[PDB]
Symmetry: D2
Subunit: 209 residues, 4 copies
């Protein structure tokens, strides 16, 4: 019908709780073949059991580069080609850790999977930013990475977009958001209907300034 | 059932061709009760008939303030409450500002009173695809962002869609994606924004333009 | 010397109070030949008298198009060419009158600008600086419309060495403070100093921009 | 005497060439006491000699964290306090991952490290200026630049109440050895992107840095000045 993801293969990182879980569920309800990533194997299998069929579980430490490359190679083979990547995992030492986990991990995993998408002339990359100064830097860097990548691969029918969530469970709407509202947006961006939308950030935050 | 508009009342301006007609048809497909405004009454009824169920048709001069208030009053009454509004050299300046900015703000202001009373509404402004046009477009976006702040506490969202090139080819050189968009692509974005599933998304502009800078 | 406006002819609208007056005084101090627009003729003369020499005074209603065209006509003649235009001009229900807010805060600046770029284009040199407004929904709309106008016009005439920029002031001394990270209100002179910078030869490569001078306010 | 920097202490990184050198000369012309950082010790001394008075010279590898910390300590002690920091230094089978790490380290992390070392004293004096000059394979650079801008906007919120402003300048195409080398079609392709139909010059960036550093720009913070001829 509309905004269905039937038969598309999606890898979602940080799929263990919160927004990543909600994205996972929502993708599945729209007919996607979903691959869940996290570090808690027990919590993942629990989610895959809740949903049932067309679900894969993967473990990887996204703070380790070799481990990110391993995740890509394995998810791509076992899922047989990835269509949609949702980068959703996040959180001097502090600065380095946040940049590593909130920016570099997404760009590493993205660059591993874009080649196959470029061959197929079809893909969706969706970066979910974190909800202080280190986080703001990594977040703004991820958005800049996303916009520049969008320009690079636009002619290959791959879109690259970000979602910037507000306060999720000084908001003009006078309520916090829920993870499923982020999920719905991710379905929209992932769908064929959003083929002409790229290089964008959806701020989902109740009107925050 | 995701992104359905079942039973929602939607008023679409400029529904007679192009993006407006595509939005009207998509809304109808998603279960919306649709009000079609335009200036070509024969075209409006042809479209209405083609849809064939729960359709209203309205004529009005959007360059005339009093005419806009009348459209609002009549549409709100006949449709029994509107949930979704889609707003779709000196003489040249005034006319472009009148039709591309002032009309949308005037109709929006008239219809939000009843949306606020129901604590539910969607306002979606479609901007134009030159310095008069840019002023009107930027004004509309600024209008949308400021209004979103004003009425967010009533569960009314206000968003904009800025279309790129819609269907020689030095145009194709301007578009990184290397194709023009089609009107249905604007329509799909309007459906998303109109849905219950976009309730926390307000004050935003969706730039649907294949990556144009 | 750096950031001087020596010899340049500048027309400043809404020059009788606040930011306008500060712009005019700062322009004069930096060597500009200054033309003051306003409505209150007496206030114009008081300011002109303080600056002394190199000052022109013009009165005109910016609410009538013909009156704006006449101002452009007269000022361009008496000053013998205008290089710098500062668009600053901003119970009757005023704020909830969309038509009026748009007329005075957007259309007026666009009408005057378009009367005066003609000669700037011929000379291949000029500066347009639009000072935006400091009910609220109407003002935001006119402000965003002005910034859009300025950005588009900047593209059109960049090749003629005319820059077009806006300054968007935050809270300026004529709950509030909780919104300003710097925990103070700005003063008019601070907008004046930004206007000097943009008007200068040193800002020749900066066009189509908005300087938000607001103590770090969000949005 | 408008936009003067008389008696203010300014540290300028990447000051041996291009924009950095133009900033340093402009600052010195406005009465600033200037600290020149770079890697070419001799090129630094030439510039210092030409300026002739109220100049200090420093070397440091901005890709090494301990070396950035050392620069901050030694510059602040020698200059007896730093009021203005201009983060200018940067860069314009290879291991693509290493190239990512290097661009982030040099164009984002270096600036944030030096800034964090120097704002404490500024916060104590309740006065200061942080000015980040962003860079002019582009995807890695765009990420670092966007990151630096986001770092600057956040920091600006954090320290606005201490009257330290934090701003960025994003230059467009500025004339240099590199642009001078462009062939006819490359040149014509670049001009078509620039409404003003000319490249900027380094002094144009310098003038903007003077503006932001001045007392006249005390209410301007969290901003990026795009100096790019309409691009």
């Amino acid at each position: 019908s509309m905004f269905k993801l039937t038969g598309r293969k999606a890898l979602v990182t940080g799929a263990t709780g919160g927004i990543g879980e909600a994205i996972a569920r929502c993708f599945h309800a729209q007919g996607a073949i979903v691959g869940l990533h996290g570090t808690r194997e027990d919590k993942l299998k629990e989610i895959a059991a809740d949903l049932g069929k067309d679900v894969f579980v993967f473990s990887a430490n996204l703070s380790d580069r070799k481990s990110i490359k391993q995740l890509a190679e394995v998810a791509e083979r076992e899922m047989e080609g990835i269509d949609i990547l949702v980068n959703n995992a996040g959180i001097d030492q502090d600065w380095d850790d946040v940049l590593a986990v909130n920016l570099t991990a997404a760009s590493t995993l993205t660059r591993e999977l874009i080649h196959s998408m470029m061959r197929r002339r079809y893909g969706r990359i969706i970066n979910i930013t974190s909800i202080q100064t280190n986080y703001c830097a990594a977040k703004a860097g991820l958005i800049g990475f996303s916009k520049a990548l969008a320009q690079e691969i636009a002619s290959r029918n791959i879109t690259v977009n970000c979602i910037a969530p507000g306060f999720i469970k000084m908001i003009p709407m006078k309520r916090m958001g829920i993870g499923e509202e982020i999920a719905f947006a991710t379905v929209y961006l992932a769908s064929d209907e959003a083929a002409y939308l790229t290089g964008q950030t959806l701020h989902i935050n109740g009107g925050m300034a």
